[PDB]
């Protein structure tokens, strides 16, 4: 199914092994799980 949008403050990045991860610029944190509204 489709991808719901990212919430404010979050960025989607890809690491040097090709793995998607998510960056929270409000918290200055990263995580694997896609955030949801």
């Amino acid at each position: 199914p489709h991808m719901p949008p990212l919430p404010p403050g979050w960025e989607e990045k890809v690491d040097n092994l090709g793995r998607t991860y998510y960056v929270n610029h409000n918290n200055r944190t990263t995580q694997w799980h896609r955030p949801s509204l």
């Binding site: 690491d15 793995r19 991860y21 960056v23 610029h25 200055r28 990263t30 995580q31 694997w32």
Partner: peptide, 14 residues
């Protein structure tokens, strides 16, 4: 699951 945590936050951007 994944090998390791994800890359650290890009703190130099602060």
């Amino acid at each position: 699951e994944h090998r390791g945590p994800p890359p650290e936050y890009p703190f130099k951007g602060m």
